[PDB]
PDB file of C-alpha atoms in Angstrom:
ATOM      1  CA  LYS I 126     -16.775 -27.654 -21.801  1.00 27.75           C
ATOM      2  CA  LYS I 127     -18.378 -25.668 -18.698  1.00 25.67           C
ATOM      3  CA  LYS I 128     -15.619 -26.947 -16.087  1.00 23.68           C
ATOM      4  CA  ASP I 129     -12.831 -25.164 -18.614  1.00 22.65           C
ATOM      5  CA  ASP I 130     -14.834 -22.422 -18.664  1.00 21.07           C
ATOM      6  CA  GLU I 131     -15.317 -22.151 -15.290  1.00 21.06           C
ATOM      7  CA  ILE I 132     -11.550 -22.406 -15.403  1.00 18.68           C
ATOM      8  CA  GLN I 133     -10.837 -19.833 -17.552  1.00 17.22           C
ATOM      9  CA  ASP I 134     -12.727 -17.275 -15.722  1.00 18.72           C
ATOM     10  CA  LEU I 135     -11.153 -18.251 -12.232  1.00 20.83           C
ATOM     11  CA  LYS I 136      -7.604 -17.948 -14.786  1.00 22.30           C
ATOM     12  CA  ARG I 137      -8.931 -14.039 -15.706  1.00 20.26           C
ATOM     13  CA  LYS I 138     -10.682 -13.229 -12.269  1.00 15.91           C
ATOM     14  CA  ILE I 139      -7.000 -14.023 -11.039  1.00 16.45           C
ATOM     15  CA  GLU I 140      -5.133 -11.620 -13.632  1.00 18.22           C
ATOM     16  CA  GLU I 141      -7.781  -9.262 -12.932  1.00 16.37           C
ATOM     17  CA  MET I 142      -6.807  -9.198  -8.946  1.00 16.75           C
ATOM     18  CA  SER I 143      -3.421  -8.926 -10.016  1.00 15.41           C
ATOM     19  CA  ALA I 144      -3.360  -6.150 -11.859  1.00 17.41           C
ATOM     20  CA  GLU I 145      -5.574  -4.415  -9.132  1.00 19.08           C
ATOM     21  CA  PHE I 146      -3.196  -5.134  -6.343  1.00 18.99           C
ATOM     22  CA  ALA I 147      -0.476  -3.588  -8.721  1.00 20.69           C
ATOM     23  CA  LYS I 148      -2.190  -0.901  -9.593  1.00 17.28           C
ATOM     24  CA  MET I 149      -3.441   0.041  -5.788  1.00 15.75           C
ATOM     25  CA  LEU I 150      -0.092  -1.007  -4.106  1.00 16.54           C
ATOM     26  CA  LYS I 151       1.737   1.505  -6.712  1.00 18.33           C
ATOM     27  CA  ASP I 152      -0.974   4.165  -5.797  1.00 14.89           C
ATOM     28  CA  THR I 153       0.103   3.642  -2.156  1.00 16.13           C
ATOM     29  CA  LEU I 154       3.798   4.436  -2.665  1.00 17.31           C
ATOM     30  CA  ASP I 155       2.964   7.393  -4.992  1.00 16.77           C
ATOM     31  CA  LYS I 156       0.977   8.565  -2.222  1.00 14.37           C
ATOM     32  CA  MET I 157       3.140   7.882   0.632  1.00 15.39           C
ATOM     33  CA  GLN I 158       5.879   9.670  -1.389  1.00 19.55           C
ATOM     34  CA  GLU I 159       4.199  12.177  -2.090  1.00 18.41           C
ATOM     35  CA  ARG I 160       3.390  13.107   1.349  1.00 14.89           C
ATOM     36  CA  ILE I 161       7.064  12.313   2.645  1.00 15.28           C
ATOM     37  CA  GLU I 162       7.917  14.776   0.097  1.00  9.76           C
ATOM     38  CA  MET I 163       5.506  17.333   1.299  1.00  7.76           C
ATOM     39  CA  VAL I 164       6.370  17.373   5.106  1.00  7.34           C
ATOM     40  CA  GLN I 165      10.356  17.835   4.098  1.00  7.12           C
ATOM     41  CA  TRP I 166       9.238  20.614   1.655  1.00  7.58           C
ATOM     42  CA  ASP I 167       6.733  22.369   4.467  1.00  7.29           C
ATOM     43  CA  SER I 168       9.352  22.509   7.233  1.00  6.50           C
ATOM     44  CA  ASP I 169      12.859  24.319   6.616  1.00  5.06           C
ATOM     45  CA  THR I 170      14.691  21.573   7.513  1.00  5.49           C
ATOM     46  CA  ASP I 171      18.444  21.558   6.325  1.00  7.26           C
ATOM     47  CA  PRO I 172      19.214  19.869   3.173  1.00  2.68           C
ATOM     48  CA  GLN I 173      21.206  16.908   4.673  1.00  3.55           C
ATOM     49  CA  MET I 174      17.683  15.322   6.381  1.00  3.42           C
ATOM     50  CA  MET I 175      16.651  14.815   2.710  1.00  2.95           C
ATOM     51  CA  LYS I 176      19.343  13.842   1.353  1.00  2.00           C
ATOM     52  CA  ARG I 177      19.927  10.957   4.305  1.00  2.00           C
ATOM     53  CA  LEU I 178      16.581  10.066   3.584  1.00  2.00           C
ATOM     54  CA  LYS I 179      16.628   9.933  -0.062  1.00  2.00           C
ATOM     55  CA  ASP I 180      19.846   7.650   0.856  1.00  2.00           C
ATOM     56  CA  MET I 181      18.007   5.942   3.201  1.00  2.00           C
ATOM     57  CA  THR I 182      15.600   4.722   0.726  1.00  2.00           C
ATOM     58  CA  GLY I 183      17.541   3.365  -1.544  1.00  2.00           C
ATOM     59  CA  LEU I 184      15.881   4.922  -4.309  1.00  2.00           C
ATOM     60  CA  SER I 185      18.573   6.022  -6.211  1.00  2.00           C
ATOM     61  CA  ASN I 186      18.323   6.121 -10.376  1.00  2.00           C
ATOM     62  CA  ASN I 187      20.043   3.461 -11.673  1.00  2.00           C
TER      63      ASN I 187
ATOM     64  CA  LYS Y 126     -12.288 -34.667 -10.601  1.00  2.00           C
ATOM     65  CA  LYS Y 127      -8.893 -33.202 -11.946  1.00  6.30           C
ATOM     66  CA  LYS Y 128     -11.002 -30.466 -13.612  1.00  5.30           C
ATOM     67  CA  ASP Y 129     -12.971 -29.506  -9.315  1.00  5.97           C
ATOM     68  CA  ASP Y 130      -9.012 -30.171  -8.010  1.00  5.64           C
ATOM     69  CA  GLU Y 131      -8.059 -27.540 -10.460  1.00  7.21           C
ATOM     70  CA  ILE Y 132     -11.062 -25.473  -9.565  1.00 10.80           C
ATOM     71  CA  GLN Y 133      -9.892 -25.817  -5.790  1.00 11.75           C
ATOM     72  CA  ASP Y 134      -6.467 -25.102  -6.559  1.00 10.38           C
ATOM     73  CA  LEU Y 135      -7.040 -21.519  -8.412  1.00 11.66           C
ATOM     74  CA  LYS Y 136      -9.678 -21.052  -5.248  1.00  7.62           C
ATOM     75  CA  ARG Y 137      -6.647 -21.217  -2.962  1.00 12.19           C
ATOM     76  CA  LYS Y 138      -4.332 -19.474  -4.736  1.00 12.61           C
ATOM     77  CA  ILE Y 139      -7.268 -16.604  -5.486  1.00 11.28           C
ATOM     78  CA  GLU Y 140      -7.872 -16.350  -1.292  1.00 10.92           C
ATOM     79  CA  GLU Y 141      -4.408 -16.841  -0.327  1.00  7.31           C
ATOM     80  CA  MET Y 142      -3.387 -13.944  -2.552  1.00 10.05           C
ATOM     81  CA  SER Y 143      -6.449 -11.871  -1.537  1.00 11.35           C
ATOM     82  CA  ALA Y 144      -5.187 -12.384   2.524  1.00 11.96           C
ATOM     83  CA  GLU Y 145      -1.662 -11.442   1.372  1.00 13.87           C
ATOM     84  CA  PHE Y 146      -2.978  -8.690  -0.463  1.00 14.34           C
ATOM     85  CA  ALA Y 147      -4.379  -7.135   2.454  1.00 12.82           C
ATOM     86  CA  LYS Y 148      -1.841  -7.855   5.226  1.00 13.78           C
ATOM     87  CA  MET Y 149       0.655  -5.885   2.254  1.00 12.87           C
ATOM     88  CA  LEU Y 150      -1.912  -3.328   2.290  1.00 14.05           C
ATOM     89  CA  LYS Y 151      -2.009  -3.438   6.314  1.00 11.20           C
ATOM     90  CA  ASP Y 152       1.730  -3.078   7.081  1.00 13.26           C
ATOM     91  CA  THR Y 153       2.169  -0.133   4.018  1.00 13.72           C
ATOM     92  CA  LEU Y 154      -0.523   1.476   6.352  1.00 16.66           C
ATOM     93  CA  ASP Y 155       0.945   1.035   9.381  1.00 20.20           C
ATOM     94  CA  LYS Y 156       4.463   2.428   8.524  1.00 20.63           C
ATOM     95  CA  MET Y 157       3.048   4.643   6.492  1.00 17.96           C
ATOM     96  CA  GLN Y 158       1.676   5.936  10.216  1.00 19.95           C
ATOM     97  CA  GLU Y 159       4.649   5.084  11.843  1.00 23.19           C
ATOM     98  CA  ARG Y 160       6.290   7.502   9.758  1.00 25.13           C
ATOM     99  CA  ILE Y 161       4.221  10.303   9.363  1.00 24.23           C
ATOM    100  CA  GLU Y 162       4.343   9.846  13.287  1.00 24.78           C
ATOM    101  CA  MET Y 163       7.915  10.154  13.669  1.00 22.24           C
ATOM    102  CA  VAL Y 164       8.091  12.665  11.232  1.00 18.43           C
ATOM    103  CA  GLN Y 165       5.520  14.872  12.846  1.00 19.06           C
ATOM    104  CA  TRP Y 166       7.288  14.497  16.349  1.00 17.74           C
ATOM    105  CA  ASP Y 167      10.883  15.247  15.806  1.00 17.54           C
ATOM    106  CA  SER Y 168       9.368  18.897  14.458  1.00 17.79           C
ATOM    107  CA  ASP Y 169       7.613  21.601  16.748  1.00 17.77           C
ATOM    108  CA  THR Y 170       4.393  21.474  14.553  1.00 17.34           C
ATOM    109  CA  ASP Y 171       1.615  22.869  16.909  1.00 16.26           C
ATOM    110  CA  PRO Y 172      -0.691  20.021  17.824  1.00 17.27           C
ATOM    111  CA  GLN Y 173      -3.709  21.942  15.697  1.00 16.46           C
ATOM    112  CA  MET Y 174      -1.685  20.539  12.701  1.00 16.99           C
ATOM    113  CA  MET Y 175      -1.245  17.490  14.013  1.00 20.18           C
ATOM    114  CA  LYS Y 176      -4.834  17.338  15.195  1.00 20.89           C
ATOM    115  CA  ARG Y 177      -6.285  18.800  10.924  1.00 23.06           C
ATOM    116  CA  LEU Y 178      -4.082  15.987   9.659  1.00 23.90           C
ATOM    117  CA  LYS Y 179      -6.177  13.296  11.579  1.00 21.74           C
ATOM    118  CA  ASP Y 180      -9.292  15.076  10.854  1.00 23.27           C
ATOM    119  CA  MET Y 181      -8.502  15.084   6.987  1.00 22.17           C
ATOM    120  CA  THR Y 182      -7.685  11.271   6.667  1.00 17.96           C
ATOM    121  CA  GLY Y 183     -11.197  10.263   8.047  1.00 15.77           C
ATOM    122  CA  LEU Y 184      -9.491   7.560  10.406  1.00 16.39           C
ATOM    123  CA  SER Y 185     -11.773   8.717  13.375  1.00 16.07           C
ATOM    124  CA  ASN Y 186     -12.332   5.610  15.885  1.00 18.83           C
ATOM    125  CA  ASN Y 187     -16.031   4.400  15.733  1.00 18.58           C
TER     126      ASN Y 187
END
């Protein structure tokens, strides 16, 4: 029973670590995209450049 | 013995996942820095803005 409890605790810790990893990487991607968009808008670059970057990133709604 | 072996396997998986998550964070940060540097260098922003951004990011080497 004690080994079973330890295994269950380890699996729960694994699930928590996976959840935290997912949330942290989601936050990192959000921050990166927000910074990219802010640096894109602050300058007066031609919209072609931002369209090209959006095409290269492959984030088109599907 | 089998429960101990499964505990060992769970610990091995946990450590491997931690290592891969840390390496993925490092790769994401490196790519973000590379892209930000490229965007800053392509434009003619005053070095003051880059210095201010570096100060804000809190990445001063010790």
